[PDB]
Amino acid sequence: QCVNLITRTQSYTNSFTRGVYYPDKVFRSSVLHSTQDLFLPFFSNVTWFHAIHVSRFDNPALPFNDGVYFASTEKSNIIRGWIFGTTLDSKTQSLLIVNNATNVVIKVCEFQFCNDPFLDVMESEFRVYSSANNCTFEYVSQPFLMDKNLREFVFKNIDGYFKIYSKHTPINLERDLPQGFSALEPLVDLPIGINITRFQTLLALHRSYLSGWTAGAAAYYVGYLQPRTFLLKYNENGTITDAVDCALDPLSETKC
Amino acid sequence: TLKSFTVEKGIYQTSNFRVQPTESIVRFPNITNLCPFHEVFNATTFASVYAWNRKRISNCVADYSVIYNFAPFFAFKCYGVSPTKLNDLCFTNVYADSFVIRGNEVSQIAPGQTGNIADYNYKLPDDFTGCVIAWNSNKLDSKPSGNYNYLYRLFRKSKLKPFERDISTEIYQAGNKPCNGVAGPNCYSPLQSYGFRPTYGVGHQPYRVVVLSFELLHAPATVCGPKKSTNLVKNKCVNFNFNGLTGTGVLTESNKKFLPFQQFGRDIADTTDAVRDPQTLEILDITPCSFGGVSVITPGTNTSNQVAVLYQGVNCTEVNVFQTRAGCLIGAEYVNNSYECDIPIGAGICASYQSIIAYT
Amino acid sequence: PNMTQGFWENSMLTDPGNVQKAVCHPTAWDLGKGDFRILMCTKVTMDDFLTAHHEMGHIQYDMAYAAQPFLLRNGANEGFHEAVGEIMSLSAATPKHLKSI
Ligand SMILES: *[C@@H]1O[C@H](CO)[C@@H](O[C@@H]2O[C@H](CO)[C@@H](O)[C@H](O)[C@H]2NC(C)=O)[C@H](O)[C@H]1NC(C)=O
Ligand SMILES: *[C@@H]1O[C@H](CO)[C@@H](O)[C@H](O)[C@H]1NC(C)=O
Ligand SMILES: *[C@@H]1O[C@H](CO)[C@@H](O)[C@H](O)[C@H]1NC(C)=O
Ligand SMILES: *[C@@H]1O[C@H](CO)[C@@H](O)[C@H](O)[C@H]1NC(C)=O
Ligand SMILES: *[C@@H]1O[C@H](CO)[C@@H](O)[C@H](O)[C@H]1NC(C)=O
Ligand SMILES: *[C@@H]1O[C@H](CO)[C@@H](O)[C@H](O)[C@H]1NC(C)=O
Ligand SMILES: *[C@@H]1O[C@H](CO)[C@@H](O)[C@H](O)[C@H]1NC(C)=O
Ligand SMILES: *[C@@H]1O[C@H](CO)[C@@H](O)[C@H](O)[C@H]1NC(C)=O
């Protein structure tokens, strides 16, 4: 039941100092720690995607590179998860992350994904994929898309483990990527062990009951992580409150 | 230390005191999400050997002890691994294959065997890594009129490959003429019934068999047997093993408020200084056990053979005992009088022989 | 070999009573499916002892050939089956065997 319904436009914005996450699960208090990891560089070019469905294939699959920074200002019900893999068909394994109002299901199977996958609302996954065979992983837990509010995620695929980091922020009367530091916290480490080179965002569409689906829009920001050395400031309570990118400018390099 | 039989008056550093570890603690996370072994070795209904049931086991803790204590077993033969090491090993996937056969055929569920069951119903490879478990099931699978719901494949064109299943009911064509679907001369239905009755001989009574096959792949192994989590002991020098992080030190109470996602703690110089207990969400200050430089304060051997021992940096309660800022001095008596320095101790304290006295 | 568990559990080695009637002829039964039984209204006599040895010789003969296919589960001729029980009846009646037990 694969149907093409979403069109997508793209613009370019500045990352500012968004995208910092905790590189490990180690408590450090009132220290300066220099770590080399896959980080989103400061003031980097981030692509802002607007996906519009009004009531042709114009929603291509994005590359994954070395990791993806995802942000959204939308409500928790419009964006409902993501798709990860290489070929996105029945010949290779793929990872499907689907959130709903009660829980999140993370599942790795051989999905035959649609070109324009979307969850239609009960909820049906027949517009996301046509078949799912040889399924090798399932993980159900509490959801990480809950309820103006900026939602930030960091996805990494390192040595068999898919790491997801998340943070929510009460933004207000400012550009969607605000100033200041909001360190993302480790949310899940998934023992997946698959090759991921491409990814795609999942949206939810409502049936119209009157142009089969209700018209809608979703805006999200995508940035790409790079191997970078960061210097993180840990305060008295162990929270990362500040960071300097070691290779951004000579002042920060001197600080590093 | 000085490689001489006569020691001149002074203080000499001779050894290093250490507090030996007394106990070992291996506290690990509260065991939960136990693999469903209570649903494979204890089902209300088993399967025929031709359509043998396979359950994949992943992302859980493998508590094989219930399997061990789940019935008296006619055979617990393990091919490739020893029955004990299982729990301390971690495999990627565990396949549990369940079926019912007759006692005489239990020997056929093994690598390198032949028969009706091995060739046409269930075949194990010659490099099989796993265990075979069988037990008697007269009270559950035998009826007096005859239990005709357990079937086996008697006729097949070719032998089965390892870990293969055939569910076909195709009429076995043993002759030259086509069968045409209808049973008739030289055309036999391949699935025959195991007519179990309670009065059969031991070799023919129904036996339930579960075959556990362990496989490792390139993926991270997520079926890791439960690691014993011993009780927690505080305020002593104990070898600690917390979530795979090992060391040796005292575990004192901590005032540090960790964030919910953090598990370990590190110093400015990247040395562990704190940890979170995985059984009870409390924070402990890991502090290494006391060590000190044992220094010996002695006058000349010409005058006397009395010695005093200074444990540098060690409080006196953790080893004529006097406490100094330099450390604990044993064998010298503090005198409130002040004299010139004869043997330097440190922090304003000096020692002399008059017995050996220590003074400011 | 020893005697099976089902032999001890299922055989009726004593006359059951007046209310339940049974054939009193000594007979060894090879039910099959590993089931071997003796129908014998045993009493206490030297005779019934020798006859019990005879019928257990019959049952041992039936047990040895059980592995064979169904239509060959018999004696090689009609004489062997009773001979292998009568040799036990011969050996058990000797003065040496009676002094041994
Ligand atoms: C939200 O997602 C959860 C998990 O996918 C759904 O809960 C499952 O519902 C199915 C019904 O087909 C049951 O078989 C499962 O046992 C349920 N799983 C759990 C963990 O509860 C739930 O129905 C979804 N809700 C909506 C509104 O779509
Ligand atoms: C972001 O990338 C686009 C095309 O890749 C480029 O035209 C644009 O100038 C970039 N933004 C900045 C701030 O350089
Ligand atoms: C994947 O599925 C197909 C049929 O569903 C099967 O032939 C193939 O062997 C399966 N591969 C694995 C690795 O399970
Ligand atoms: C991952 O997939 C891409 C695209 O198919 C392929 O080019 C690459 O070699 C793969 N990497 C590995 C390690 O298999
Ligand atoms: C740290 O914790 C203390 C005690 O709970 C709290 O008063 C303080 O606001 C927290 N934050 C900082 C930045 O000190
Ligand atoms: C195992 O089987 C016995 C059989 O009656 C039953 O009493 C018991 O509850 C079962 N245990 C489990 C854990 O299923
Ligand atoms: C660990 O198990 C014990 C025993 O049931 C329980 O009291 C304790 O609260 C558990 N801890 C956690 C973090 O669940
Ligand atoms: C069965 O025979 C063996 C010797 O082969 C003997 O040791 C054993 O006790 C016998 N069984 C019984 C129940 O007497």
DSSP B6-67: S--SEEEEEEEEE----EEE-------SB---TTTSS-SS--BSTT-EEEEE-SSB--HHHH
Residue of B nearest to C3 (CA): B201
Ligand nearest to the CA of A239: 5
Contacts of B228-236 with CB under 8 Å at 24 or more apart are: B228/B26, B228/B28, B229/B26, B229/B27, B229/B28, B229/B29, B229/B30, B229/B31, B229/B278, B229/B279, B230/B24, B230/B25, B230/B26, B230/B27, B231/B25, B232/B25, B232/B27, B232/B277, B232/B279, B233/B23, B233/B25, B234/B284, B236/B22, B236/B23
- CA gap A252, A250 in Å, rounded: 6
- CA gap A5, A28 in Å, rounded: 48
Interface check C16 vs B, CB under 8 A: no
For residue A167, the number of C-alpha atoms closer than 13 Å in the C-beta half-sphere is: 18
List chains adjacent to chain B, taking adjacency as at least 3 C-beta pairs closer than 8 Å: A, C
Interface check B259 vs A, CB under 8 A: yes
In 3D space, the residue among A39, A216, A232 whose CA is nearest the CA of residue A121 turns out to be A216
What tokens were used for B329? 């001095």
Q: Are B335 and B312 in contact (CB under 8 A)?
A: no
What tokens were used for B293? 């430089």
What tokens were used for B346? 């440190």
**Which residue ranges of C make up the annotated binding site for substrate?**
25-26
Per the DSSP assignment, residues forming a β-bridge with B57 are B94
* Distance from Cα B220 to the centre of ligand 4, integer Å: 19
Q: Are A39 and A184 in contact (CB under 8 A)?
A: no
DSSP string computed for A25-89: SEE--SEEEEEEEEEPPTT-EEEEEEEEE----B-PPEE-TT-EEEEE-S-TTTEEEEEEESS-S
CB neighbour class for A19 (10 Å; exposed up to 12, middle 13-18, buried from 19): buried
The catalytic residues of C are 55
Helices (H) and strands (E) in chain C, counts: 4, 2
In 3D space, the residue among A56, A8, A19 whose CA is nearest the CA of residue A219 turns out to be A8
Q: Which helix (H) or strand (E) holds C54?
A: helix C46-64
- CA gap B320, B315 in Å, rounded: 15
Q: Where would I find the H helices in chain A?
A: 250-255
> Are C33 and B200 in contact (CB < 8 Å)?
yes
* Contacts with A60 (C-beta within 8 Å, 6 or more apart), sequence order: A8
Interrupted backbone of chain C, residues before each interruption (C–N > 2.5 Å): none
Per the DSSP assignment, residues forming a β-bridge with B91 are B223
Q: Which residue has the tokens 């006692």?
A: B103
What letter represents residue C34's amino acid? G
Q: Are B36 and B63 in contact (CB under 8 A)?
A: no
Torsion of CA B106, B107, B110, B115, to 10 degrees: -90
Q: Which helix (H) or strand (E) holds C95?
A: helix C95-100
List chains adjacent to chain C, taking adjacency as at least 3 C-beta pairs closer than 8 Å: B
Chain-centre distance for alpha carbon B260: 26
Best residue among A9, A10, A11, A12 to mutate for probing ligand 2, ranked by most atoms within 8 Å of CB: A12
With H, G, I as helix, E, B as strand and everything else as coil, classify residue B290.
coil
Cα B185 to Cα A69, A218, A252, B151, B153: the distances in Å are 71, 70, 90, 22, 19
Orientation of helix C80-92 relative to helix C46-64, angle to 10°: 140
Experimental structure resolution, Å? 2.7
Would strands B333-334 and B356-359 be described as parallel, antiparallel, or unpaired?
parallel
Q: What are phi and psi of A13, to 5 degrees?
A: -135, 180
Per the DSSP assignment, residues forming a β-bridge with A165 are A154, A186
Chain-centre distance for alpha carbon B66: 16
At CB < 8 Å, which residues of chain A contact B? 22, 25-29, 31, 136-139, 160-161, 185-186, 191-193, 237-239
What letter represents residue A211's amino acid? S
> Are B265 and A22 in contact (CB < 8 Å)?
no
In 3D space, the residue among A238, A248, A250 whose CA is nearest the CA of residue A28 turns out to be A238
- CA gap B119, B103 in Å, rounded: 17
Q: Are B183 and B189 in contact (CB under 8 A)?
A: yes
Q: Are B275 and B264 in contact (CB under 8 A)?
A: yes
